[PDB]
Amino acid sequence: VQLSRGDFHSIFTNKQRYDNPTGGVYQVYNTNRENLIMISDGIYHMKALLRNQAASKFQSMELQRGDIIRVIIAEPAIVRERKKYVLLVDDFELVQSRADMVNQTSTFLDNYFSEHPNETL
Amino acid sequence: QLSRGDFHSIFTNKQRYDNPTGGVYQVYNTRNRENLIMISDGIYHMKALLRNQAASKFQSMELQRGDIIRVIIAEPAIVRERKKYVLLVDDFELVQSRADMVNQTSTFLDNYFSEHPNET
Amino acid sequence: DDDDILELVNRPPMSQMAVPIKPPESQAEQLMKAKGEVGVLRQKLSMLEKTLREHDDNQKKLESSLKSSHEEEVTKLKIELERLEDERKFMLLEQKH
Amino acid sequence: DDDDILELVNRPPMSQMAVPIKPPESQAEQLMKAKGEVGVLRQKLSMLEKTLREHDDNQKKLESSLKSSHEEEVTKLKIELERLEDERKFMLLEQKH
Numbered sequence: 001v002q003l004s005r006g007d008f009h010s011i012f013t014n015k016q017r018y019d020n021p022t023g024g025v026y027q028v029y030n031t032n033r034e035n036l037i038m039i040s041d042g043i044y045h046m047k048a049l050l051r052n053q054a055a056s057k058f059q060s061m062e063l064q065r066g067d068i069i070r071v072i073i074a075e076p077a078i079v080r081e082r083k084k085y086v087l088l089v090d091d092f093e094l095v096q097s098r099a100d101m102v103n104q105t106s107t108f109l110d111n112y113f114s115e116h117p118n119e120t121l
Numbered sequence: 122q123l124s125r126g127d128f129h130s131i132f133t134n135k136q137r138y139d140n141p142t143g144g145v146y147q148v149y150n151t152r153n154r155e156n157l158i159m160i161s162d163g164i165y166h167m168k169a170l171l172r173n174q175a176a177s178k179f180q181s182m183e184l185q186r187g188d189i190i191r192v193i194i195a196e197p198a199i200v201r202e203r204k205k206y207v208l209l210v211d212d213f214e215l216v217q218s219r220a221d222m223v224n225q226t227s228t229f230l231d232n233y234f235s236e237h238p239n240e241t
Numbered sequence: 242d243d244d245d246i247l248e249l250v251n252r253p254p255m256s257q258m259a260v261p262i263k264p265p266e267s268q269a270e271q272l273m274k275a276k277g278e279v280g281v282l283r284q285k286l287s288m289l290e291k292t293l294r295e296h297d298d299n300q301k302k303l304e305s306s307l308k309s310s311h312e313e314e315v316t317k318l319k320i321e322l323e324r325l326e327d328e329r330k331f332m333l334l335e336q337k338h
Numbered sequence: 339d340d341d342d343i344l345e346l347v348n349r350p351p352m353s354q355m356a357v358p359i360k361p362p363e364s365q366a367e368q369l370m371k372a373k374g375e376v377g378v379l380r381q382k383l384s385m386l387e388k389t390l391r392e393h394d395d396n397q398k399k400l401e402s403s404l405k406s407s408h409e410e411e412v413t414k415l416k417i418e419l420e421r422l423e424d425e426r427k428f429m430l431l432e433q434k435h
């Protein structure tokens with residue numbers, strides 16, 4: 001199984017990708033506000049807000065750091081006067097349970113875009 | 122403390138048969154089948170069928186051997202080929218929980234009446 | 242072996258103070274029954290709305306047929322009246338001396 | 339913190355495939371809700387039966403009032419017919435008598 005390397009950057013810079021940010025393969029990076037998680041594309045790590053079916057599935061399956069998911073329904077969202085990036089995940093599928101971390105020294109997406117602010121749509 | 126020999130009075134005395142209430146008895150043995158228990162008067166032990174509020178109360182309270190009760194609503198009954206005596210208990214009150222057995226060598230009432238059948 | 246005694250559980254009590262208590266049901270049994278009742282009541286309601294609507298459509302249809310049957314009878318009699326009115330006018334017009 | 343992010347939980351989704359799922363409820367929470375629904379549906383059904391019965395009683399009442407009024411009108415016309423029959427009858431009797 002391979003993660004969609006650098007896809008979080010593509011979601012906010014490529015229009016076709018922003019319009020439909022689905023099909024991405026991500027690793028859970030870190031785990032009320034229990035539905036707000038950290039996900040990893042192998043290069044960048046960003047916040048993901050689980051909603052609807054995803055929020056139910058993630059909680060019942062007790063998904064945690066290292067599990068690999070494929071996003072099926074998602075919306076991109078930028079908040080706090082364009083400072084904060086979030087992927088709203090409405091549906092996903094479990095790809096692999098408790099896999100080894102592909103990267104532990106990944107870059108926080110919001111930190112990248114604060115340094116490169118012109119790249120976003 | 123128990124109504125000593127009352128089970129015998131219930132089936133031999135008409136006034137007692139007509140209204141077999143107020144008796145103080147000790148639970149002798151436990152376990153709808155669960156609602157059929159063995160009760161003791163200190164001399165005799167007989168079967169008791171708990172019905173209505175008494176069936177609910179006994180089950181929720183988890184009454185067992187050694188407990189002392191006072192029968193409030195009851196009906197006498199002699200059922201299969203007269204070898205079967207039962208007290209239908211519709212209501213009772215808890216007198217004492219897990220008291221020591223007043224008698225362990227008591228006589229089964231049906232066994233007594235099989236030997237003395239002329240008095241019923 | 243005590244089936245003949247257990248048969249007396251439901252025999253009507255002589256005391257009016259003796260009250261039947263429904264056998265305890267677990268939350269799971271009660272939730273299933275409630276959910277099942279919800280489905281049954283929803284079916285009954287959907288059916289009864291259809292019935293009310295049909296009865297209403299039928300009331301309207303039967304009233305229309307009634308009014309139309311009446312108007313036919315009233316027309317027949319009015320036509321009969323005009324005929325007798327014309328007869329009398331024919332009699333006045335021709336002069337049977 | 340991330341309150342501005344968490345605020346998006348309830349923002350209507352772009353996808354019609356995105357379905358809200360109520361956070362898990364215990365059997366006790368569900369039993370209360372279900373019992374409440376049962377009561378509401380039973381009230382709605384009891385009320386709808388009353389309505390059907392009333393509509394039925396009204397159909398019967400309105401038809402009876404209709405038949406009564408029509409019969410009054412038919413009687414009025416029949417009375418006028420007999421009057422004209424008698425008039426003609428007298429005119430003929432005069433024409434010979």
Ligand SMILES: [Cl-]
Nearest residue numbers: 172173176250
């Ligand atoms: Cl009972």
Ligand SMILES: [Cl-]
Nearest residue numbers: 363364365366
């Ligand atoms: Cl539960």
Ligand SMILES: [Cl-]
Nearest residue numbers: 417418420421
């Ligand atoms: Cl007249």
